[PDB]
């Protein structure tokens, strides 16, 4: 899928509403990292059952 996208994207024209949307995917990927990592580390339980 990446090889196709790599060869096809450079010669096409995309609407600004789509170019503005891919930008926001990076931010939506960062926002969940810390809350999920602390859950995997079991920090919330350790504080609630102090």
């Amino acid at each position: 899928a990446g090889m196709a996208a790599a060869a096809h994207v450079p010669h096409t024209i995309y609407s600004p509403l789509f170019r503005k949307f891919v930008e926001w995917i990076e931010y939506l990927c960062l926002m969940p990292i810390f809350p999920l990592a602390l859950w995997l580390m079991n920090v919330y339980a350790a504080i609630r059952y102090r």
Binding site: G2, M3, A5, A6, A7, P10, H11
Partner: protein
């Protein structure tokens, strides 16, 4: 000894034989020398050499490096029968450029000396990742066949082979330039691996000699077929054919009847020993009038390089399998490996190509190291490892010291 005869090259390619004063300094001769080449070009009816703007006339080696203007022709390592080139070298003087604001300064400078990514390279990256992706896919499917005799491995691998080969065909026919061809070759070459294990996995029952015959057979056929219709990437395909062929012979013999593996390994070792002497002949027979000669020369050069690599791979696998730290006269294969390595270590000097000579030299070194590793893992004790470690560091140190000192 008062003069030396040399061939001097002039504009666009005329060579002229001249007898030069061997001790006057080169700067005294370049001016009258230029007059003579012009006189001959003028009589020949060609266009004479002329200056352009700011620069100077210089006398250089065929490598382009100019000779020191103050030294004598005998003071430099120029001998009778050598050749030189008379050339115009332009003036490099120009104003200096300054930028004050470090932000703008770093951006402008850094953008000149290094290359940014582009759509042409982007495709080669993706093409290489898909090739890596499928060789991993066949690996896990192959590992499953080693514990299960079901059809899954051949069923699923076969469709991948078909799909990868299908896409490669469109790219090959649509290609236009060398960059386009690179992407196509990488994709097609990636089809050989799935098709190969797809066939070998079909015969039911536990894996072994019967399956081995199918695998190395289709592999040799596929590599040869690709080489025949493509005619490019000679060296790599040649290597696959050789290692595939000899392995098929061993597989068939073991499958039909063989008293021992040592016998087959011994047969293969002897076959490889004699093949080294045949390699240049094989390479030579495997290969407007100027085009044919240069094409023939580079094609021939390619075949010998690949042919040697295939042989090198076979001997190290066989040799390390024949020697043994517990079986009988433990010292016999050790010294035999030594004598076998000596031939390759010395014979490397007979070939002019850099990579060919390097691969030959390296082939001997790796065997000695591999044998010691085998004798260090097994028959393990402080004496064994202590001896092997000392040997492995002293071995190359003595070789390089004898050559450099």
């Amino acid at each position: 000894p008062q003069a030396v005869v040399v061939g001097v090259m002039a504009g666009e390619g005329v060579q002229i034989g001249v007898l030069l004063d061997a001790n006057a300094p080169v700067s005294v001769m370049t001016d009258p020398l230029l007059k003579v080449v012009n006189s001959r070009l003028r009589e020949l009816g060609e266009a004479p050499l002329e200056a352009t703007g700011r620069g100077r006339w210089a006398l250089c080696l065929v490598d382009g490096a100019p000779l020191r203007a103050t030294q004598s022709l005998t003071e430099q390592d120029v001998y009778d029968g050598d050749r030189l080139w008379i050339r115009f070298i332009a003036d490099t003087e120009r104003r200096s450029q300054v930028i004050e604001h470090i932000s703008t300064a770093v951006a402008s400078d850094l953008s000149k000396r290094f290359a940014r990514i582009d759509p042409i390279v982007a495709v080669q990256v993706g093409a290489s990742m898909v090739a890596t992706g499928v060789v991993l896919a066949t690996g896990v499917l192959g590992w499953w066949r080693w514990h299960h005799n079901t059809w899954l491995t051949t069923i699923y691998t076969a469709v991948i082979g078909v799909l990868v080969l299908a896409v490669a065909m469109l790219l090959l026919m649509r290609a236009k330039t060398d960059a386009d061809r690179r992407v196509a070759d990488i994709m097609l070459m990636s089809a050989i691996m799935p098709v190969t294990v797809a066939a070998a996995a079909a015969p039911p029952g536990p894996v072994g000699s019967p399956q081995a015959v199918l695998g190395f057979g289709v592999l040799t056929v596929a590599a040869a077929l690709a080489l025949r219709f493509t005619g490019r990437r000679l060296g790599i395909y040649t290597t696959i054919v050789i290692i595939g062929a000899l392995t098929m012979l061993a597989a068939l013999a073991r499958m039909v009847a063989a008293t021992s593996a040592v016998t087959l390994l011994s047969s293969l070792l002897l076959i490889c020993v004699v093949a080294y002497h045949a390699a240049p002949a094989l390479s030579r027979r495997l290969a407007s009038s100027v085009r044919d000669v240069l094409l023939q020369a580079e094609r021939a050069r390619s075949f010998l390089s690949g042919l040697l690599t295939g042989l090198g791979v076979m001997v190290v696998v066989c040799m390390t399998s024949l020697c043994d730290p517990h079986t009988g006269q433990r010292w016999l294969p050790l010294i035999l490996a030594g004598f076998t390595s000596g031939f390759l270590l010395l014979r490397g000097r007979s070939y002019v190509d850099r990579w060919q000579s390097i691969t030959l030299a390296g082939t001997a070194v790796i065997i000695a190291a591999a044998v010691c590793v085998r004798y260090a893992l097994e028959l393990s004790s402080p004496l064994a490892v202590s001896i092997v470690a000392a040997i492995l560091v002293l071995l190359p140190a003595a070789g390089m010291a004898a050559a450099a000192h």
